[PDB]
């Protein structure tokens, strides 16, 4: 029941919004998850690891180059926008809105969201393998050797770029090898980010979960911290809930969310 949700929304002064893959999916971003999402022969799991990067950095950068480049045509959807406009509108009223996203595509920044926490990092940030420096980067192509590479067809031929010519650190002292500043399978989340999110979820008096459920990583790390404090939690996703069974608004975030946040 929407009008009950809206009563909380009306009151709420510190709102946290946790966004999952569903919302990036609705803008047509590939997530490479479940059966169907392949890039060439492989799935996310195969390439998104420190093992794969150490063993074939040209292949992984090809994959990450592709994903960077498909974003030139995928745009924020109404869910992205309603969240950004909400943030802005409530900001002026001295209320507040934080976004905690597992997504790496910067669509929240591109819709105009500002207080965003990217817990899995970003396709358009690099980290130096040598000096560890994090730097924004939308350079297209990220480097010449990758130009028009990363093509997604199963029997595309590998680029096999020499590692010296892969993207490198700009401080010439260093010239270190860059990697996408994205959290890979079997790496740890940044501890400072988690400390901030903890802090934000403590202030929080209404919490939205969008394009994912409370039950699963990563929403499951946080939704308990808020729920235990008796704070309402609204899921907006495409997953059903059984006939018999805090708020859940079924259907697409693009359709469900803007009416809720107006």
């Amino acid at each position: 029941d929407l009008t009950a949700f809206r009563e909380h929304f009306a009151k709420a002064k510190h709102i946290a919004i946790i966004t999952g893959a569903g919302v990036s999916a609705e803008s047509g971003v590939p997530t490479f998850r479940g059966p169907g999402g392949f890039w060439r022969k492989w799935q996310a799991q195969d390439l998104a690891t420190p093992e794969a990067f150490s063993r074939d950095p040209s292949l992984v950068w090809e994959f990450y180059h592709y994903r960077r480049e498909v974003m030139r045509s995928k745009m924020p959807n109404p869910a992205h926008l309603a969240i950004a406009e909400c943030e802005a509108r409530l900001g002026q009223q001295g209320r507040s809105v934080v976004i905690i996203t597992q997504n790496i595509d910067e669509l929240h920044h591109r819709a105009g969201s500002k207080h965003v926490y990217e817990i899995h990092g970003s396709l358009f940030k690099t980290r130096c393998m040598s000096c560890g420096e994090v730097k924004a980067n939308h350079k297209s192509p990220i480097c010449p050797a990758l130009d028009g590479k990363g093509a997604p067809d199963p029997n595309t031929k590998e680029a096999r770029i020499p590692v010296e010519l892969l993207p490198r650190c700009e401080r010439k002292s260093c010239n270190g090898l860059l990697r996408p500043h994205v959290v890979w399978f079997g790496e740890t989340l940044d501890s400072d980010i988690l400390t901030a999110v903890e802090r934000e979820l403590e202030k929080c008096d209404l919490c939205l979960v969008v394009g994912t459920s409370s039950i699963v990583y990563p929403a499951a790390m946080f939704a308990p911290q808020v729920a235990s404090r008796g704070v309402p939690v609204a899921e907006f996703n495409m997953e059903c809930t059984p006939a018999t069974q805090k708020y859940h608004f079924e259907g697409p975030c693009g359709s469900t969310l803007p009416p809720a946040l107006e």
């Binding site: 899995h120 959290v183 890979w184 079997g186 790496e187 740890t188 989340l189 988690l194 990583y217 790390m221």
Partner: peptide, 8 residues
């Protein structure tokens, strides 16, 4: 530190 996906 928190393993990503809880280490699936």
């Amino acid at each position: 530190x928190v393993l990503k996906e809880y280490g699936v």
